[PDB]
Amino acid sequence: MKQIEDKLEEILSKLYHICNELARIKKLLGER
Amino acid sequence: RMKQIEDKLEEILSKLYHICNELARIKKLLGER
Amino acid sequence: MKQIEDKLEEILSKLYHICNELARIKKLLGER
Amino acid sequence: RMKQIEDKLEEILSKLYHICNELARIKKLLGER
């Protein structure tokens, strides 16, 4: 169960990296 | 057409933020085990 | 706890929608 | 430049599939409660 809690933190960190990268992609497309 | 992609990325980012909040909420409930 | 299991199924379904849409976006960009 | 975006979307999709498998693995472990 703690292994699950630690996995969730890990997954959340990965998702924040993805959000940052999608925002970068949306910027780049916006720049033309 | 590129504006439609941009707008969809914006929508996908908001959905992903919602998912992150829900998974954070789960994590808190597991720390209350 | 079952509420958590049901939330995870819900989140997974949403993520599969997102994957499908990103693939559509990658197609569209590829088409020029 | 557009090929770099496409390649990054491909990388992000593979990361999201990995996340989906990990969350499915959690879900199974919660059904074994």
Curated annotation (Swiss-Prot), chains A, C:
It comes from the Eukaryota. Disruption phenotype: Abolishes recruitment of the mediator complex to the upstream activating sequence (UAS) of amino-acid starvation responsive genes. Decreases RNA level of genes involved in amino acid biosynthesis and cofactor biosynthesis during amino acid starvation or methyl methanesulfonate stress. Growth dependent on amino acid supplementation. Sensitive to amino acid starvation. Sensitive to purine starvation. Decreases cellular glycogen levels during glucose starvation. Induction: Translation is induced by amino acid or purine starvation, or during growth in low or poor carbon sources. Translational repression during nutrient-rich conditions is dependent on four uORFs (upstream open reading frames) present in the 5'-UTR of the mRNA; these promote ribosome dissociation. Translational induction occurs in conditions reducing translation machinery efficiency, leading to ribosomes scanning over the uORFs, and increased translation of the mRNA. The rapid translational induction is followed by transcriptional induction at later time-points, independently of the uORF sequences. Phosphorylated by the cyclin-CDK PCL5-PHO85. It is found in: Nucleus. Residues 4-25 are annotated as: Leucine-zipper. Master transcriptional regulator that mediates the response to amino acid starvation. Binds variations of the DNA sequence 5'-ATGA[CG]TCAT-3' in canonical nucleosome-depleted 5'-positioned promoters, and also within coding sequences and 3' non-coding regions. During nutrient starvation (low or poor amino acid, carbon or purine sources), it activates genes required for amino acid biosynthesis and transport, autophagy, cofactor biosynthesis and transport, mitochondrial transport, and additional downstream transcription factors. Belongs to the bZIP family. GCN4 subfamily. Residues 89 to 100 and 106 to 125 define the N-terminal activation domain (NTAD) and the central acidic activation domain (CAAD) respectively, which can function independently to promote high-level transcription of the target genes. Homodimer. Each subunit binds overlapping and non-identical half-sites that flank the central CG base-pair in the pseudo-palindromic motif 5'-ATGA[CG]TCAT-3'. Interacts with the mediator tail; the interaction with GAL11/MED15 is direct. Interacts with the SAGA histone acetyltransferase complex. Interacts with the SWI/SNF chromatin remodeling complex. This is General control transcription factor GCN4. It comes from Saccharomyces cerevisiae (strain ATCC 204508 / S288c). The lineage of its organism: Eukaryota, Fungi, Dikarya, Ascomycota, Saccharomycotina. The chain holds residues 250 to 281 of 281 of the full protein.
